[PDB]
Design a protein around this ligand. Structure first.
Ligand SMILES: CC(C)(C)NC(=O)[C@@H]1C[C@@H]2CCCC[C@@H]2CN1C[C@@H](O)[C@H](Cc1ccccc1)NC(=O)[C@H](CC(N)=O)NC(=O)c1ccc2ccccc2n1
Ligand SMILES: CC(C)(C)NC(=O)[C@@H]1C[C@@H]2CCCC[C@@H]2CN1C[C@@H](O)[C@H](Cc1ccccc1)NC(=O)[C@H](CC(N)=O)NC(=O)c1ccc2ccccc2n1
Lengths: 99, 99, 99, 99
């Protein structure tokens, strides 16, 4: 798609077999999604940004569909108010910024 | 140009007559710049990042150049580790996210 | 051996009971072999090369012989144009880089 | 020096007068450096790996300091997450893979 930026870049994702909404975030290194029940092994990690850091669960090699594009990679699960797709999965689906 | 997301999409900006490096961010409408002495009228605002909420100063109709492309708009100034260009200004330079 | 690099460092490997040719790669974390029917359980994975990501099958604890050296480790199977031996298995044959 | 392969084989390099870290890569024909401003004439070229090919700037006769050893030859500049030193320069500094 050609995602425009007049509105929030919202897409449907599928994680843990469940459909959710998420925000495509070129300004995030990582992918972090709202606390959820997710199958798979995980380990603790901190991730940061404005206002400081939050503690999350780091799940490796998680299957996740982004607007119908398949990715399998690292998904952080924690206290974010919004599901954000970051560069680790944006690169997997071949996303670029263009102007 | 086209910018892959293998690395943070950092570009040079000009704001307040100064050159800075800034991150192109589809994930926020707001633009936030690290503390600096901009002239003119301002109002305080509270904004939320992943780690919590911060206080910024909001400056309106600020001239800003992004990767050589002219823009004018609202700039927030406060405690951010990285200069962040949000959707407000990204739309002015004709940026889209493509995959 | 002491392998000089005027040609690709290609060697014979044995995996799945089959002989194959593969490239010794200090630049790769993982080992990737062209699609083939290995027996047993596997996990999906996506790995990122210079031209993008490919989906692969991750087989763990796989018997593999590399240039006459026995090894046991993780082998990824998918659409690589060239069979690649990565650092995971290069450490088992005791490969070091000298200059 | 002699490097084991338990960690990524990163060394300090100098190219265009700038210090950078790069990966010593026996599994790469060519030397590919992340997009940067580099003086000199170049021509477009495609180079490939896992996932396909990318478009790069091919600079001839570029000087590159690799962990203190001088090497001169073809240097490709393009959209990669990692700087890699390939066989074309590894041969020049006498690099071998030993096991
Ligand atoms: C910029 C502002 C207006 C405050 N909006 C936001 O920050 C919103 C808030 C939303 C609700 C909370 C959870 C995140 C979403 C998305 N974010 C935008 C979102 O794009 C945000 C922008 C950003 C980038 C870099 C540094 C700071 C802030 N990115 C992030 O929060 C990601 C999170 C991550 N670990 O991937 N942070 C980083 O990628 C990042 C990069 C460098 C850093 C250096 C030092 C300290 C922290 C650093 N964090
Ligand atoms: C194997 C995997 C786990 C996916 N990791 C990687 O591929 C990482 C990714 C990193 C980030 C992007 C930039 C490259 C680095 C280093 N690479 C490893 C790196 O060692 C990689 C391994 C490889 C060799 C041959 C064929 C495919 C892949 N080599 C390369 O990507 C180099 C690039 C070059 N032109 O010099 N490719 C080749 O030397 C090469 C040789 C023969 C080929 C035949 C057909 C198609 C492509 C071919 N590419």
């Amino acid at each position: 798609p050609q995602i425009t930026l007049w509105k929030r870049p919202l897409v449907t994702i599928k994680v843990g077999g469940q459909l959710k909404e998420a925000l495509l975030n070129t300004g995030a290194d990582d992918t972090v999604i709202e606390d959820m029940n997710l199958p798979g092994k995980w380990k603790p990690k901190m991730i940061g940004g404005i206002g400081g850091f939050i503690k999350v669960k780091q799940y490796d090699q998680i299957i996740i569909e982004i607007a119908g594009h398949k990715a399998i990679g690292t998904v952080l699960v924690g206290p974010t108010p919004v599901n954000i797709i970051g560069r680790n999965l944006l690169t997997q689906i071949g996303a670029t910024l263009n102007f």
